[PDB]
Paper text:
The type VI secretion system (T6SS) is a contractile injection machine widely distributed among Gram-negative bacteria. The T6SS sheath comprises two proteins, TssB (VipA/IglA) and TssC (VipB/IglB), which form tubular structures similar to the T4 phage gp18 sheath (Leiman et al., 2009, Lossi et al., 2013, Clemens et al., 2015, Kudryashev et al., 2015).
Here, we report the atomic structure of the TssB1C1 sheath encoded by the H1-T6SS cluster from P. aeruginosa. The 3D structure of TssB1C1 was obtained at 3.3 Å resolution using helical reconstruction within RELION (He and Scheres, 2017). Since 12- and 13-fold symmetries are present, and given that all known contractile systems have 12-fold symmetry, we assume the 13-fold symmetry of the TssB1C1 sheath is due to sample preparation. Two β strands of TssC1 (β11 and β12) are joined by two donor β strands, one from a neighboring TssC1 subunit (β13) within the same protofilament and the other from an adjacent TssB1 subunit (β1) in a different protofilament, but within the same disc, to form a β sheet interaction (handshake interaction) at the inner layer of the sheath (domain 1). Two α helices (residues D117–L133 of TssB1 and S66–M86 of TssC1) and a third α helix (residues E39–E54 of TssC1) form a tri-helical bundle (domain 3; Figure 2Biii). Our structure reveals key features for T6SS sheaths such as the extended TssC1 N-terminal α helix that forms an inter-protofilament tri-helical bundle at the outer layer of the contracted sheath.
Numbering used by the authors:
A (entry chain a), C (entry chain A): 4 to 135
B (entry chain B): 90 to 498
D (entry chain b): 90 to 242
E (entry chain N): 397 to 447
F (entry chain N): 141 to 191
G (entry chain M): 4 to 69
H (entry chain P): 295 to 396
I (entry chain b): 346 to 498
């Protein structure tokens, strides 16, 4: 990038002009060009909002660092009716939005559905009750 | 009504989307019903034909205009039968298209065969017998014309879109079934096959610069990606609706190409389809000399007429721009002789592959003659020999104990 | 097109006149002449107005860019009686004008006919009702 | 529903955690359902395919851009059968992936074999006979293409 | 000979429309039929004479 | 003929069909007039389709 | 079948256009053409119904599977 | 100044580089950190060649860097095609500024 | 793998599993010349298409950066010929282990041609021969009393 | 040589933010609106103007 | 040095002393403008291995 020593050399040169230049016999530096892998997948199935139009979605870099931030940012959710085995009745409509990779575990699934949350809290209060 | 309009716009959309349009390729549409075209072409007939709305547009404003567009190829998008009005319309459009050097391409109605289906095309034993009756007197009189070599006809029409349904092309607005039980041909959306020929012409030009290869299975006359509708049937099931209305055997194909049609035949068990040959409506007349018969057959084939039409456009523009330059008979001989000679590949004629498509002529010969009793006016004749295309082959295999050529001698 | 250097040369010439001219040995520039394909077809069948007289229709350039503008400009329409299977009765007269290539799809066909529009809206309200 | 979403995020998580990412390796995700991908790739077909949201992203902004990322390999995360819509989607993604030199990788549905399980894969005597029927005409026409070498299943 | 009739039918039917002269057809047919003939090994061969 | 249509038209005559190879009769033919007629005709068909 | 790289090449070409094409010196791919054997036989002798008229019977593929 | 001639005024590494461009980085949603392009918009190689065919000199900005360059210098003149390829070459050379400076 | 799939098969009684081969969706067409058939088969295998795709990325970037430098046909021949030749291991081709994975090409050949009627525009062809990978092996074992190669002669 | 900048209005744009919108720029300059522009580019004195 | 070669043709104007006409043919150093590359996966190199 033409070292300022070259500016001093070509512009107003002292009788003694001393420059330092890196020695490369054949030049031709490496091309670099990292390997990127674009991934397309169906995420946030049945969202609650219109979400985003195409061509505005882009491709978002992902890694182990932002993964949970990519879930929480993308807000993947699921809403469906399921038979209620707890107290007869019929289909139970549940709405779940997973904000972390741990939210697919059955514990977090139980904590997100409000009824199963009340039952799970009941169990933690009784099991915590049997021990002092 | 909805099937007619849908098929019109669907065919036009097929032509537009499948064409690579740029500075070189353009597509200009004129919306005119067949009754209106026959009407306006009926108003001006005989002498007055030189003055018509259609002739003005096609010839005056473009091929006749200074610095216009010679208009290339024309696509009819109409179904023409042997009826008096359709014979008149074809006669007139053959006059116009012949004047402007712009081959006319359209589809032949199923009623030409006294059929009305194209599902019955396999029923008759001989198609050449159909056109003998006096009913076709007008048709035969049309094919005998010298202006009819500018009209191609593609009888079968390809399938425009795949029937809506959960299995195929689901609508996704509401649960929808298109019915369209096997065959019967009335439920399916059929696009005119003049547009598949048109797409082939535009493709040929885009790739090779010329419309020379618009036919053949592997020579560029292929129509790919056709919708294949597969419906279950009895027993093993799994039989698909033919993309073109009916399958045409090689015998039927040659028999239609003899009658001046351009069949679109569908390859069995595949969505592929092709134009085996492009033969204009003109019936080439036989002659005593086999050379005259050859020249008479070449003129009836669209692949060559596109070449000569293109040379007509070029010559029109370049000579129109050369008007006013100092020229003698010898000067015009050198300029025309050396102008036509850059579209001919002399050294590589036997060994070449794609350049034979880019250079349409195997040889070229110019005879210039100055008009007597006038300066600056000349008469020229361009003899240009096109590259031949394989048309047919009869093979007789012989089991031989001693080879007759070399072993036996 | 006779470069201004030629004007300086022929008109009042300096003793030293320096012009630049492109070198073409044989001249004879290419003819160009793009390939246009004129298409004639029956469009806007049974229009609502007199439309346009012949010789005033011309040829309009079409491509993938203006295609929908060519439909919407041309206003292709269709009007006919059709048996009404919805509620007995008899022929149902429908008037449809297609402003886009998507208007030939069965969904848009249903949206354009007013009765089928009411039924389709009913279906979207019920199917949207079964889900939250 | 929960099995579908769970499998999607669980697969993506497997890809992320088992990959050693640095300056050299990147992973870019685009969330687009198979219906949306087939829809946007259906809007632009034939001539207009050069202009698409997917082609813009994959080719223009990266492989076509000055000083961009040529995008390497692409992973579908979809189940493609011989159906007309899936043959169209594979045709188009083969055009894009062929243009950008980015092989497309996805999974083949159990319905390609007329199966729907992959538990029945041992039942048929000959798999090459399955693809002969006219039902697969679109599939065979796809495999014969020269742009299909960019699609693994 | 029947098999050669099938082959010739299909391959020529697919070659219809390609630029061909008499010499071009001579080279294509001559070189097409010549891959079913074993010239050098005619006296010494066993299974290839069947193939 | 129904037999000639099936054997020749739909396969050996069709574009992209199956030239049908060899044909097997599974019939017992004697010198009787009807069997000589049947063999004559099947020889015409089989000769036309190279089968 | 003209790879989309050719579309990018001929249609609007970058200054650097990189295509991949399979190398075939002599081209001329094999004809394929499987060997089918049509079999005619007397089956369903003395049927209970009219069965089917000729030209509607066709030829049905058979194997160990069906 | 460097070479005594205006011959190399184009190319990325051939002397058509525009360096040190102001890079304005503003936070956006999620990960943030996206910068305003120094030239008004990013031009793809296809857009670049398509503009150079139309007689423009695009200044295209290298992605994620303050660097930018002139890929080619094409004058406003549309060079005419000729029969002889040598005449077409001479006609193309005249339309390029790097030579006209010489 | 003949039908253009990439099976993931599980090793019995173990949690291990593997991809035996990577075959793209494309059905490679047969040709008269066995060399053309070989080249047609190589193109259908993803392991090689990744190599050529990577060379496409590299070539795109490096040539895009070389636009505007003084170049003749011979200069481009030397620069492309010597650029492709650092991914080829010439001396160690038969004896190497991991470098055959790092250098994907056994040989490379460049044919440069200048476009007529235009300065500064060139057409190039890159012929690159990849390192072959074992695909299959048919073995016929023979119990022999006298070795046919050496003992019997 | 004359060097200047081409307005965003040459493309019928007025931004240069919309430069990515059109599919083909070569089609923009075909219209008769640009007749003067095309007549300028065809000139032999226009090779002295960069934009 | 911008020129790879240079050629001068001098001609004296007839009907006048001391006035001359000259033509300078100067061939510039070409600059890389574009490159189309077709990569080919090849089993036997067509240039050397296959010959």
């Amino acid at each position: 990038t033409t070292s300022s020593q070259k500016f001093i050399a070509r512009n107003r040169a002292p009788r003694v002009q001393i420059e330092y230049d890196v020695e490369l016999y054949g030049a031709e530096k490496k091309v670099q060009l990292p390997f990127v892998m674009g991934v397309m997948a169906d995420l946030a199935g049945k969202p609650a909002e219109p979400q985003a139009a195409v061509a505005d979605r882009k491709f978002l870099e992902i890694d182990v660092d932002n993964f949970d931030a990519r879930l929480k940012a993308m807000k993947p959710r699921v809403a469906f009716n399921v038979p209620n085995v707890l107290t007869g009745e019929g289909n139970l409509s549940l709405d779940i939005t997973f904000e972390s990779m741990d939210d697919f575990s059955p514990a977090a699934v139980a904590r997100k559905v409000d009824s199963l949350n009340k039952l799970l809290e009941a169990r933690t209060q009784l099991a915590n009750l049997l021990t002092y | 009504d909805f099937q007619q309009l849908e098929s019109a716009w669907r065919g036009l959309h097929y032509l537009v989307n499948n064409t690579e349009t740029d500075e070189q390729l353009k597509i200009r549409v004129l919306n005119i019903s067949k009754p209106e075209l026959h009407k306006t072409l009926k108003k001006f007939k005989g002498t007055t034909w030189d003055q018509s709305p259609i002739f003005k547009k096609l010839y005056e404003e473009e091929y006749g205009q200074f610095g216009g567009e010679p208009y290339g190829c024309l696509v009819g998008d109409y179904y023409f039968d042997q009826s008096p009005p359709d014979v008149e319309l074809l006669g007139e459009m053959a006059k116009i298209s012949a004047a402007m050097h712009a081959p006319f391409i359209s589809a032949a109605s199923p009623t030409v065969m006294g059929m009305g289906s194209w599902q019955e095309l396999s029923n008759p034993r001989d198609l050449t017998k159909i056109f003998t009756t006096p009913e076709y007197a007008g048709w035969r009189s049309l094919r005998e014309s010298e202006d009819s070599r500018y009209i191609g006809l593609t009888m079968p029409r390809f399938l425009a879109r795949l029937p809506y349904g959960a299995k195929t092309d689901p609508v996704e607005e509401f649960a929808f079934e298109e019915e369209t039980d096997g065959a019967d041909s009335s439920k399916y959306a059929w696009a005119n096959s003049a547009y598949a020929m048109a797409v082939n012409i535009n493709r040929s030009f885009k790739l090779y610069g010329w419309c020379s290869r618009i036919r053949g299975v592997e020579s560029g006359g292929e129509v790919q990606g056709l919708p294949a509708h597969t419906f279950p049937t009895d027993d093993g099931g799994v039989d698909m609706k033919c993309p073109t209305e009916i399958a045409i055997s090689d015998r039927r194909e040659a028999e239609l190409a003899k009658n001046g049609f351009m069949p679109l035949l569908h390859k069995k068990n595949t969505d592929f389809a092709a134009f085996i040959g492009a033969q204009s409506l003109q019936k080439p007349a036989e002659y005593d000399d086999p050379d005259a018969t050859a020249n008479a057959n070449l003129a009836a084939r669209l692949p060559y007429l596109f070449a000569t039409c293109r040379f007509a456009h070029y010559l029109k523009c370049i000579v129109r721009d050369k008007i006013g330059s100092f020229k003698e008979k010898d000067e015009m001989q050198r300029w025309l002789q050396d102008w036509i000679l850059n579209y001919v590949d002399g050294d590589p004629a036997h060994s070449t592959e794609t350049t034979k498509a880019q250079h349409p002529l195997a040889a070229a010969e110019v005879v210039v003659e100055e008009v007597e009793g006038n300066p600056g006016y000349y008469n020229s004749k361009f003899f240009l020999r096109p590259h031949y295309q394989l048309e047919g082959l009869t093979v007789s295999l012989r089991l031989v104990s001693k080879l007759p050529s070399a072993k036996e001698a």
